[PDB]
Design a protein around this nucleic acid. Structure first.
Ligand SMILES: [Zn+2]
Ligand SMILES: [Zn+2]
Ligand SMILES: [Zn+2]
Ligand SMILES: [Zn+2]
Lengths: 332, 183, 78, 206, 89, 130, 46, 66, 66
RNA sequence: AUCGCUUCUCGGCCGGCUAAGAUCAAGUGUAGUAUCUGUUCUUAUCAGUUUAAUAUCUGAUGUCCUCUCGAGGAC
């Protein structure tokens, strides 16, 4: 017997969303990722009716997705974190109404792995170097520079390898025209495996480390480390240089902490709770995801709880020194 | 203790002589009995290096699948003096096989083992798959019975055999088609 | 009783149809059916060693029902 | 109405006939593989379809020689006739005829929100043709991420007797030189090819 | 004495000389050239520009992998430029 | 007939045949007979001769991709913990060969292993039922 | 280069060859052996 | 082989082998969007909190060694 | 090819001079008493022409005659 | 009819001469395996290493006293 397969209704589930300018237009095309599917939408400034410009199936499990831009560049490419051992850089040709495969690079084995990258994906604000990472042991970097014709060329990889180290999340860091930085959440289980008592199960804090790419030395050295008080799930870029301070926000259990280097001391704030809540007090809270709103005038952040509570995160700074943090209830 | 270790398993029969020396018997007991997995081959603890030529000297050289036999190549292949060989170079004749390209476009299309629960080991060939209740053709011929084999009439009177106690043979406690009169 | 003596056979019979033949009753552990070298043919009498004795005494009871080539087969203890 | 199909959470299918007089529950067959089973469906009396918590679709057929009354860990089993990885977990399986006047087919939803169907072939011609389709398409039009199609559909279990329609339909999106040149490697025309894939969809579904 | 260097695979294309020209590196075979070789500039640099991946002569062509090593996914490991267990030159 | 051993070279070369066949046929649905042949392949696992052991390795690798890991692993389970050192050396070599590739697809096929005192060996995630 | 130590195989084969062909034909007997000449076969016999 | 995590050998303990297959299962869960969503459905949480609890269970599972 | 003639000639010579030696299902020569395998029948024959092969036939001689 | 001899008959085992006529083919090296032959452990006990278990390897021959390995006494 033989069976021919047909899809009829394509999956409506949306795992990821990235907003960039893919046509070189002042409008913002929204590239969203259905489960096995790559998808491209066009919302309308006036009526807001969301036009689907493209829907394509990649025949592979999408893992993470990020959009980026060359420095001061006109247009935006796409980086596809995949389940294969290949990162691919894509460009949507507005005319042809379909994507082209701009770059195909093979960093390792196939399928969702423990040590194989593609899991977590970060990129520099200036688009110099994109950093790709697995859950454990392997963190790789591809450096990007436009060619003589200003068409994108990808470099050779690098290696961040650190033994027996779990990576919670990786977020690009803002340093304008500098040696790029990266915020890697890490933890070491090597303390836990050699501790028959079970003490290392507790009393082990996830280490926040900033790697520094260095163009001139063309390797990636561990530079910054601080132990995190409590375990946060994810991090947030804080645009630095001209606009705002350069630092990272850390979303932690029942807290958010701006935690940065230089002389900058950490700033913690509790995650506010609603008056007269019916839930188990034993159930804490963190934030799910965050979408930064970046404006030539100002900037802020948007956070959400399990319960769906979006807050507007703000920074109170003295010059480049942030003194405190202000969170106003935004919506739900 | 190899004794009490046999009380902890659904199929303790899996535990064997050297099994009690295992570095982790308290698991291997639970693995070896896993549902569809297959046993380890037995040729070790036999020092004979997996084979000898005793039973292997009585085997046929080879025999073709019937699909290849009907073709007719078998008769084509079958002798020569040396000067005939240097004549075979100087003379040479062409087209000795002269196969039918229709036939060899036919057989393997138009015309043309074991399950997972089995694995081969050294000496095993015929036996498991002549048993009480199962005999070969010819010996049927010497016996000369038309389609029970008649001493399973006396397996009525004298009783079920001590040697194969689990026995069932047709018509008695085993309620039979072709050759095989007992299982 | 572990062994039996078997008379009155035809040489087309060999050690194999004895193997198969008496294991129909109960397994022959050790088979002995002489091959005569000189004229390369069998006289037709057999010796059978079993697992233990019970096999072979049941074998005395049941055993002499076999008929090899239309003809009678002797089985007695030994 | 005759037999009963047990689905294990781990060891998958257990064929069980209920003897009415003895009232006994009778396991006469089981699967050759462990499979984490979401739900089952009957293509027929002798076949079973099943989905994996991992999002696989298997179809296992009894041998026609099965023993209907009986008394390592089993006696006789059933061969696995189909393995296909949807990549999306399937919580229900239902066989039906989607459209009036259409051909009977198999139906699977998934957890991702997608709804899709499996369809039998009525001819070896469309069979082999779609085979060449899949073949020259794969290498000549690789998947987008660089991931290979074949492995992705063979992901947990190797593909057995399934042609992927969503790859065959991408014939539309290829460049006209791809479309044509491939059609030549297929010895057809883009209209021929295209309509011939519209055949199965049309006849069976929308 | 002779074993892979297995440094991280870069974007540099492999280069085989006259001798090694047709060989798929790992399977040692000439069959079904399909994909392409990548080795790090740490293995391929300078006097190694257009050097043979094996003997140390000038590369006249580029190595192609077989289909055999493709499905077994061996082409994705560290850069398969053989190093003698002395230096590479 | 060949894999059943007259002399080692038979097992070796025949095994190589099983390899290239096993890569070639992949995905077309013939796996059954390849399983049958895998039966006769399987005893040859043990030997110190370099060419036959590396041959058998290539063999079982191709058979890995063609048959799928599940069946492989179902032949490789019991050998892991067996008391002898030999069997563990080898079955762990095999199990590694099966492990590196397709490590992603192995998840489903690890059997149920009961939990002891200090440790919980049951993964309960798979037992969550809607 | 041809010279070397005598082997039981070469020596027994020499026995059989001498038995079959006869004493006076050496070149025929040297033809069967490897790494040995006719003179060496004769003197090895006598 | 050694530098490839999950490599086994003849001296491999139970505990290490099972904690391996655990951690690999968890990386699969982080990997496949759906199966993750199944988990979120069954036991009611966010996708986030699920992945978080898993990342907590990465080092521990089965608990202390022997 | 001249090499091919020697193989043929050294089999026939070991056939003439030859009841124990045979050829298995493969091509090798074997002594059925001693269960030895011989690369060439003549090489095998010498083992067949040896004093150890001689003994093991006598020992089996007695062992049968008892 | 028997013995002996003989004759016949039947059955079974059952390559010419010459100057011998003249003349006479071997690659290498790096790794590695297999198959032949020859030769060695009647060691007793215990302890340790080691093995799946063997095997193997590694160490010594109830204690004290007296007399000339043996004898006696005390345990
Ligand atoms: Zn290198
Ligand atoms: Zn070269
Ligand atoms: Zn290759
Ligand atoms: Zn011998």
């Amino acid at each position: 017997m033989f069976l021919y397969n047909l899809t009829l209704q394509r999956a409506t589930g949306i795992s990821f969303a990235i907003h960039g300018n893919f046509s070189g237009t002042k409008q913002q095309e929204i590239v969203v990722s259905r489960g096995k599917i790559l998808e491209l939408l066009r919302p309308d400034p006036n009526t807001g009716k969301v036009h689907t410009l493209l829907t394509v199936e990649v025949f592979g499990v999408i893992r993470s997705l990020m959009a980026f831009r060359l420095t001061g560049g006109t247009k935006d490419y796409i980086v596809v974190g995949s389940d294969s051992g290949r990162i691919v850089i894509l460009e949507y040709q507005p005319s042809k109404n379909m994507f082209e495969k701009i770059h195909q690079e093979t960093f390792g084995k196939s399928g969702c792995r423990r040590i194989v990258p593609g899991q977590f994906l970060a990129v520099d604000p200036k688009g110099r170097a994109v950093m790709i990472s697995a859950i454990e042991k392997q963190k790789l970097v591809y450096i990007l520079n436009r060619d003589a014709a200003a068409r994108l060329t990808i470099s050779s990889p690098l290696e961040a390898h650190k033994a027996n180290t779990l990576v919670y999340h990786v977020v690009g860091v803002d340093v304008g025209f500098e040696n790029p930085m990266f915020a890697c959440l890490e933890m070491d289980y090597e303390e836990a495996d050699n501790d028959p008592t079970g003490e290392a199960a507790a009393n082990t804090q996830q280490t926040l480390t900033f790697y520094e790419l260095d163009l001139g030395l063309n390797h990636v050295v561990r530079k910054y480390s601080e132990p995190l008080e409590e375990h946060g799930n994810f991090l947030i870029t804080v645009p630095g240089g001209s606009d705002g301070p350069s630092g990272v926000l850390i979303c932690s259990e029942n807290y958010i902490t701006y935690k940065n280097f230089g002389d900058q001391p950490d700033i913690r704030c509790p995650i506010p709770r609603r008056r007269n809540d019916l839930d188990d007090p034993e159930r804490g809270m963190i934030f799910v995801c965050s979408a930064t709103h970046k404006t030539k005038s100002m900037f802020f952040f948007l956070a959400q709880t399990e319960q769906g509570d979006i807050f507007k995160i703000t920074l109170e700074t003295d010059e480049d020194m942030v003194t405190e943090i202000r969170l106003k209830y935004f919506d739900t | 203790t190899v004794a009490e270790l046999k009380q902890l398993v659904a199929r303790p029969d899996v535990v064997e002589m050297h099994d009690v020396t295992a570095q982790d018997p308290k698991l291997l007991v639970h693995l070896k009995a896993t549902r569809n997995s297959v046993p380890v081959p037995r040729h070790w603890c036999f020092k004979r290096k997996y084979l000898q030529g005793k039973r292997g000297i009585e085997k046929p050289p080879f025999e073709l699948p019937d699909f290849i036999k009907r073709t007719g190549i078998q008769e084509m292949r079958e002798q020569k003096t040396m000067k005939s060989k240097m004549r075979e170079k100087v003379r040479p004749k062409m087209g000795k096989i002269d196969i039918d390209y229709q036939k060899l476009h036919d057989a393997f299309f138009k015309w043309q083992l074991t399950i997972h629960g089995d694995l081969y080991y050294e000496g095993k060939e015929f036996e498991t798959r002549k048993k009480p209740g199962d005999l070969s053709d010819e010996l049927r011929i010497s016996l000369g019975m038309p389609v029970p084999p008649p001493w399973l009439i006396a397996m009525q009177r004298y009783g079920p055999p001590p040697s194969y106690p689990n026995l069932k043979i047709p018509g008695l406690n085993s309620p039979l088609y072709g050759d095989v009169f007992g299982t | 009783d572990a062994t039996v003596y078997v008379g009155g056979l035809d040489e087309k019979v060999s050690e194999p149809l004895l193997w198969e033949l008496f294991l129909q009753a109960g397994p022959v552990v050790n088979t002995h059916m002489p091959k005569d070298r000189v004229t390369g043919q069998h006289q037709g009498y057999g010796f059978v060693e079993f697992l233990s004795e019970e096999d072979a005494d049941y074998a005395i009871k049941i055993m002499n029902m076999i008929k090899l080539y239309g003809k009678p087969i002797r089985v007695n203890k030994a | 109405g005759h037999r009963v199909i047990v689905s294990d959470v781990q060891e998958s299918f257990i064929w069980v006939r209920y003897k009415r007089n003895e009232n006994q529950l009778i396991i006469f067959a089981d699967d050759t593989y462990p499979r984490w089973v979401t739900t089952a469906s009957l293509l027929d009396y002798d076949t079973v379809a099943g989905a994996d918590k991992f999002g696989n679709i298997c179809v296992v057929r009894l041998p026609p020689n099965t023993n209907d009354e009986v008394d390592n860990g089993a006696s006789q089993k059933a061969e696995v006739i189909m393995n296909y990885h949807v990549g999306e977990t399937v919580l229900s399986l239902q066989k039906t005829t989607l459209i009036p006047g259409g051909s009977e087919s198999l139906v699977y939803t998934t957890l991702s929100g997608g709804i899709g169907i499996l369809v039998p072939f009525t001819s070896h011609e469309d069979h082999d043709f779609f085979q060449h389709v899949e073949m020259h398409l794969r290498s000549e039009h690789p998947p987008l991420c660089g991931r290979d199609h074949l492995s992705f559909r063979s992901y947990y279990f190797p593909v057995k007797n399934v042609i992927d329609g969503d790859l065959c339909e991408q014939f539309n999106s290829m460049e006209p030189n791809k479309q044509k040149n491939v059609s030549e490697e297929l010895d057809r025309t883009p209209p021929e090819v295209s309509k011939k894939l519209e055949d199965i969809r049309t006849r069976y579904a929308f | 004495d002779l074993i892979f260097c297995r440094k991280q695979a870069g974007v540099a294309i492999g280069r085989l000389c006259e001798k090694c020209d047709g060989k798929c590196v790992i399977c040692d075979s000439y069959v079904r050239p399909c994909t392409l070789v990548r080795i790090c500039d740490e293995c391929n640099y300078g006097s190694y520009q257009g050097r043979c991946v094996i003997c140390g002569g000038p590369g006249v062509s580029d190595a192609y992998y077989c289909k055999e090593c493709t499905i077994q996914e061996k082409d994705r490991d560290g850069c398969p430029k053989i190093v003698n267990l002395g230096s590479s030159k | 007939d060949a894999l059943m051993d007259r002399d080692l070279v038979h097992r070796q070369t025949a095994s190589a045949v099983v390899q290239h066949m096993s890569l070639g046929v992949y995905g077309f649905g013939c796996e059954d007979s390849l399983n049958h042949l895998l039966n006769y392949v399987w005893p040859n696992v043990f030997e110190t001769s370099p060419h036959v052991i590396q041959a058998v390795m290539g063999a079982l690798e191709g058979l890995r991709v063609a048959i799928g890991p599940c069946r492989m692993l179902q032949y490789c389970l019991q050998g892991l913990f067996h008391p002898a050192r030999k069997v563990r050396d080898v079955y762990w070599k095999i199990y590694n060969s099966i492990y590196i590739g397709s490590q992603d697809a192995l998840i489903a096929h690890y059997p149920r292993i009961y939990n002891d005192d200090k440790n919980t060996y049951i993964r309960y995630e798979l037992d969550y039922i809607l | 280069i041809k010279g070397g130590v005598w082997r039981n195989t070469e020596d027994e084969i020499l026995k059989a060859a001498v038995m079959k062909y006869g004493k006076n034909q050496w070149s025929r007997i040297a033809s069967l052996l490897h790494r040995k000449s006719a003179k060496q076969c004769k003197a090895r016999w006598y | 082989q050694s530098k490839y995590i999950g490599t086994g050998h003849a001296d491999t303990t139970k505990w290490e082998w099972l904690v391996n297959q655990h951690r690999d299962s968890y990386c699969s869960y982080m990997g496949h969007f759906d199966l993750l969503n199944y988990f979120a459905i069954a036991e009611n949480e966010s996708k986030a909190r699920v992945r978080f609890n898993l990342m907590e269970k990465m080092l521990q599972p089965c608990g202390p060694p022997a | 090819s001249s090499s091919e003639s020697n193989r043929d000639r050294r089999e026939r010579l070991r056939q003439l001079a030859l009841p124990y030696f045979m050829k298995n299902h493969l091509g090798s020569y074997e002594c059925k008493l001693c269960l030895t395998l011989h690369n060439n029948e003549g090489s095998y024959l010498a083992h067949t022409q040896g004093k150890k092969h001689q003994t093991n036939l006598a020992r089996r001689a007695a062992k049968e005659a008892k």
